[PDB]
Design a protein around this ligand. Structure first.
Ligand SMILES: Cc1cc2nc3c(=O)[nH]c(=O)nc-3n(C[C@H](O)[C@H](O)[C@H](O)COP(=O)(O)OP(=O)(O)OC[C@H]3O[C@@H](n4cnc5c(N)ncnc54)[C@H](O)[C@@H]3O)c2cc1C
Length: 455
């Protein structure tokens, strides 16, 4: 009876667990999680208006209810239980704890109220306990997001969607309340490179273009000669560039021109601009603008770099959201860590110089992957682990698994949240969504959750 442990209950932990249970008929898998609830960024990252994306929770829930899987929420690995303790208790340990640190802008003015990481703003509207009191001031009329990826689009979309259109989503009642009173009518998504370097994907881009009550603001000048540089582009990429190109350059028909004219909100793309400094309001109490350095591109293809021209532009705004990069956090002394890449050094999932220690997901490969990428990558780790297990490369015979860890946790006063405990909270959240017509009404207060989890 192989004993395997997984650290983190996001997509990487769950898909690694699913692979192990599917391919090994006897292995037992325990999933440890620091939050009181499972699912990671599927719950706290994926937007409320993208419920379809969250459906992977149904297969995760089937794995968690299986006889050979157990969940241990409210257990912070590296604090409540050490990695060495897990290594001593299990035949293999898989680190799947994501990339929790958001990269700071590292620019003057970043401290001004009104400046936030995009992921923290997302955590706020998604009920992540640590961002519950983010209290973003939406009394300004314009928001600026730095970085042209899908997270940027999610924030822009949430800020500009007519609030009534979010009523039947699982967005928090607290954030929806704040959104109804928001004065934000304009959102700029700024990148230091050009149109060909955007990181957004087409579903999300089209959602933005077609968002009811809004109009797109694209400068045709930024797209000069694009059709020409995309003729040898990969299909998906070319399709995305053609959609941008049409939006920027095609004169709309009568009906669309009218719809755009009557739109009270707008969003746009700004290119070749790098964040230099956040400007304060006259009394220094809040952000009043962003000073950007004009850039120009050098290099060819993927090696293109933005270099400063010397010119600067001041763009007025009351909200500045940074949406560019994340790094893993060091978790424990027994685990090697690469501070530059912000990952646990590894070779195809095997942690460098640590027999029996593996990694999957963002902590394995960096934060570039989407859920599907995370899923296949976790299957790669799962294969290497199972082959190592089958080969007799991990400890022989007995390993106590949770029997040993629970004896430690019992003595430390740590009471883990089981999957059945989570089902209790899940049922409560879903029932609370019944009156308001939502999928659920997330509990935000950790203490109230502990009561509702049976603790
Ligand atoms: C804002 C945002 C929006 C996104 N939207 C989409 C989308 O629409 N579609 C899509 O496909 N992908 C989306 N993604 C990408 C998707 O979130 C990632 O691909 C995927 O969640 C990475 O999985 P993971 O398991 O590595 O990490 P995570 O999902 O972060 O999960 C890591 C888990 O480990 C837990 N953990 C951390 N530290 C510890 C510890 N010390 N002990 C125990 N447990 C710990 C965390 O609490 C968490 O539950 C989004 C990401 C972000 C940030």
């Amino acid at each position: 009876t192989p004993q395997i442990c997984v650290v983190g209950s996001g997509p990487a932990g769950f898909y690694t667990a699913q692979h192990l249970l599917k391919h090994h008929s006897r292995a037992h898998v325990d999933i440890y999680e620091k939050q009181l609830v499972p699912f990671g960024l599927v719950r706290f990252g994926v937007a409320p208006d993208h419920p379809e994306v969250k459906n992977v929770i149904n297969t995760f829930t089937q794995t968690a209810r299986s006889d050979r899987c157990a969940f241990y929420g409210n257990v912070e690995v590296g604090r409540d239980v050490t990695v060495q303790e897990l290594q001593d208790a299990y035949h293999a340990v898989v680190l799947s704890y994501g990339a929790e640190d958001h990269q700071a802008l590292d620019i003057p003015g970043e401290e001004l109220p009104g400046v936030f990481s995009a992921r923290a703003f997302v955590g706020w509207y998604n009920g992540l306990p640590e961002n519950r009191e983010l209290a973003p001031d939406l009394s300004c009329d314009t928001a600026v997001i730095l970085g042209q990826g899908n997270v940027a689009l999610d924030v822009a979309r949430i800020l500009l969607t007519p609030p009534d259109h979010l009523e039947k989503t699982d967005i928090t009642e607290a954030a929806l309340g704040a959104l109804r009173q928001s004065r934000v009518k304009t959102v700029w998504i700024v990148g230091r490179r050009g149109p060909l370097q955007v990181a957004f994907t087409i579903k999300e881009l089209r959602e933005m273009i077609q968002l009811p009550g809004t109009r797109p603001m694209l400068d045709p000048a930024d797209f000069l000669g694009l059709q020409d540089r995309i003729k040898e582009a990969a299909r998906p990429r070319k399709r995305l560039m053609e959609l941008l190109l049409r939006t920027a350059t095609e004169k709309p028909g009568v009906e669309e021109a009218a719809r755009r004219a009557s739109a009270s909100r707008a969003w746009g793309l700004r290119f070749f601009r790098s964040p230099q400094q956040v400007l304060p309001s006259p009394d220094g109490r809040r952000a009043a603008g962003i000073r950007l350095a004009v850039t120009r591109l050098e290099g060819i293809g993927e090696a293109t770099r933005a270099v400063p021209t010397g010119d600067v532009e001041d763009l007025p705004c009351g909200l500045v959201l940074s949406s560019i990069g994340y790094k893993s956090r060091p978790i424990d002394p027994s685990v090697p860590f690469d501070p530059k890449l912000g990952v646990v050094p590894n070779m195809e999932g095997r942690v460098v110089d640590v027999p029996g220690l593996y990694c999957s997901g963002w902590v394995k490969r960096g934060p570039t992957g989407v859920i599907t990428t995370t899923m296949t990558d976790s299957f790669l780790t799962g294969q290497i682990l199972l082959q190592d297990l089958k080969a007799g490369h991990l400890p022989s015979g007995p390993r106590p698994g949770s029997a040993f860890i629970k004896a430690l946790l019992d003595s430390r006063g740590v009471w883990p949240v089981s999957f059945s405990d989570w089902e209790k909270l899940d049922a409560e959240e879903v029932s609370r969504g019944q009156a308001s017509g939502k999928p659920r009404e997330k509990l935000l207060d950790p203490q109230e959750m502990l009561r509702l989890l049976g603790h």
